Swiss-Prot record:
Source organism phylogeny: Eukaryota, Metazoa, Chordata, Craniata, Vertebrata
Entry's free-text remark on domains: The DOCKER domain is necessary and sufficient for the GEF activity.
Functional summary from the UniProt entry: Involved in cytoskeletal rearrangements required for phagocytosis of apoptotic cells and cell motility. Along with DOCK1, mediates CRK/CRKL regulation of epithelial and endothelial cell spreading and migration on type IV collagen. Functions as a guanine nucleotide exchange factor (GEF), which activates Rac Rho small GTPases by exchanging bound GDP for free GTP. Its GEF activity may be enhanced by ELMO1.
Annotated gene: DOCK1
Record-given protein name: Dedicator of cytokinesis protein 1
Family: Belongs to the DOCK family.
Tissues expressing this chain: Highly expressed in placenta, lung, kidney, pancreas and ovary. Expressed at intermediate level in thymus, testes and colon.
Annotated C2 DOCK-type domain residues: 1-178
Localization per record: Cytoplasm; Membrane
Subunit note: Interacts with the SH3 domains of CRK and NCK2 via multiple sites. Interacts with nucleotide-free RAC1 via its DOCKER domain. Interacts with ELMO1, ELMO2 and probably ELMO3 via its SH3 domain. Interacts with ADGRB1. Identified in a complex with AUTS2 and ELMO2.
Length: 178
């Protein structure tokens, strides 16, 4: 198998008509080219139990969250070239009072394999934070065809692409393969 340590480093968000920060939650998942999720390949903490979905710490009204959370992704070498990491961002109110159906507002992703048959480069990645309607946001067929990192976007300021809004929000991760 293969071990890929994925670190949620930090992000920078805003809201607009809400002159008050969001309580951003990041959900990490491993998906394949067809938009189907890979099950039980995420190993947080001690790494004794695998999950398919990981949720970060929510930093209440913090415009620039610094998660610095590391999870271990372990996927068979046979499934590495068809997989990618998907990061979903959501706002939670954590009120004992139900009011907002807090849904996904943004998404970021990174492919494990390059078009060079070479796995993902170790180090930090400045992911592009894309926004669009809920459902359209989760279409691997869509975003998989768009720039993954800002280093990639520049090798082509863009505020929209393929109908996807390229947010001013920022998100950074760090990867390490083994």
């Amino acid at each position: 198998r293969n071990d890929i340590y994925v670190t949620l480093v930090q992000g920078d968000f805003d809201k607009g008509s809400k002159t008050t920060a969001k309580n951003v939650e990041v959900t990490v998942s491993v998906y394949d080219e067809d938009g189907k999720r890979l099950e039980h390949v995420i190993f947080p903490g001690a790494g004794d139990e695998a999950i398919s979905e990981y949720k970060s710490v929510i930093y209440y009204q913090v415009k620039q969250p610094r998660w610095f959370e590391t999870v271990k992704v372990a996927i068979p070498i046979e499934d590495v070239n068809r997989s990618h990491l998907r990061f979903t961002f959501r706002h939670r109110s954590s009120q004992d009072s139900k009011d907002k159906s807090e849904k996904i507002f943004a998404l970021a992703f990174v492919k494990l394999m390059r078009y060079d048959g070479t796995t993902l480069r170790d180090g930090e990645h400045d992911l592009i934070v894309y926004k669009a309607e809920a459902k359209k946001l989760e279409d691997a067929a869509t975003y998989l065809s768009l720039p993954s990192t800002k280093a990639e976007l520049e090798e082509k300021s863009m505020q929209s692409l393929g109908s996807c809004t390229i947010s001013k929000d920022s998100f950074q991760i760090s990867t390490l393969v083994c």
